[PDB]
Design a protein around this ligand. Structure first.
Ligand code: 8YJ
Lengths: 210, 201
């Protein structure tokens, strides 16, 4: 156990927890050579139920093109987040070094997350902007990326990362700090199933969802 | 249950590679203040209980060898391993006095398969620049000649007061905020840890 020192936490006294966009990419155009991501629907249903329980306003998009992924995220950053404590985005798709697949092709992950930079999304300034990425193989303060693999998916059970994340969030999403949750997810993928997830944190405070 | 076991005779080794002067063939300028950084880093990690050794002006070959030797030692009686790199740098690469070397090479020696005596123990790398489980990287990137870098001043001030009572992520998050608010640039923590890390008990 640890204490909770209020000037070291992110202020959660807002009207809403925040938006939680889930991009569920399962079917890709032939021209990409990428195949159907069996198991992603199970991941998307478990993640949306999970983030709803936490208090997020979750929206689930499906089989998005690259222009769509860019458009929805740019528009989401142009909304007014004044009443929200944070923001979250979950990408489920194929990927390769530094890029994520749409159904028509490929787009840099940096271009998708840039929309929420402090100078481009002033109402999320000083608030955590979480990005969870399951990709099958200061203007940057307050970001945090949880990649699925520094990646496996059971066609009948879902990806290992997602299962582990959702399980940990149900039991401790409201009583553990974000890094404690992701560290336990790291240990679960590593031990319960090889693969290792990767957390990149630029956060300036502790994040508790309650 | 959820913490890295610290019941060991030694906290661990801490290698500080302090590159201040680069060869005129490399074309990197003298990093004034890195000795202020290094001296501070030396006290912090020594207070935490690391067996610290400072090497100045290493070269790509020396660094790779320095790390390979450390990886080939016996860490059985050690809780973890720390390595601090103060130098110049580019994307995915650190600068020796003689050139550039990819950070992936310096860390590869300690991967689970090549340093079995450190397996399931945290390997911490702190980089101030200007199999893969249980690794943690704290990246820098600006420095003032007479007082040292913002990142190192913060990291040492936090560790002096809280090194023994906070988890690594809490300490590093406080450093992130201290650097963001007192100077923009934000450090960057990359974590593959599988447990909570406390420098005590
Ligand atoms: O993690 C990222 C997103 S860049 C970024 C990094 C830290 C903080 C914010 C961002 C941001 O602007 O959203 C990345 C970095 C390098 C490369 Cl090559 C590809 C992706």
């Amino acid at each position: 156990t640890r204490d909770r020192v209020p000037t070291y936490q992110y202020n959660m006294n807002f009207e809403k927890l925040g938006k939680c966009i889930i991009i569920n990419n399962k079917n890709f155009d032939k021209v990409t050579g990428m195949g159907v991501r069996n198991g992603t629907d199970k991941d998307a249903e478990a993640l949306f139920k999970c983030f709803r329980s936490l208090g997020f306003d979750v929206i689930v998009y499906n089989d998005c093109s690259c222009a769509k992924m860019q458009d929805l995220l740019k528009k989401a950053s142009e909304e007014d987040h004044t009443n929200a404590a944070c923001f979250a985005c979950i990408l489920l798709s194929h990927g390769e070094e530094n890029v994520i697949y749409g159904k028509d092709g490929v787009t840099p992950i940096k271009d998708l997350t840039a929309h929420f930079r402090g100078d481009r999304c002033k109402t999320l300034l000083e608030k955590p902007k979480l990005f969870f990425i399951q990709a099958c193989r200061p203007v940057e303060a307050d970001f945090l990326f949880a990649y699925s693999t520094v990646s496996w998916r059971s066609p009948g059970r879902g990806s290992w990362f997602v299962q582990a994340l959702c399980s940990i969030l149900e039991e401790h999403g409201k009583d553990l700090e974000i890094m404690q949750i992701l560290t336990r997810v790291n240990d679960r993928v590593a031990r319960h199933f090889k693969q290792i997830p990767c957390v990149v944190s630029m956060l300036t405070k502790e994040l508790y969802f309650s």
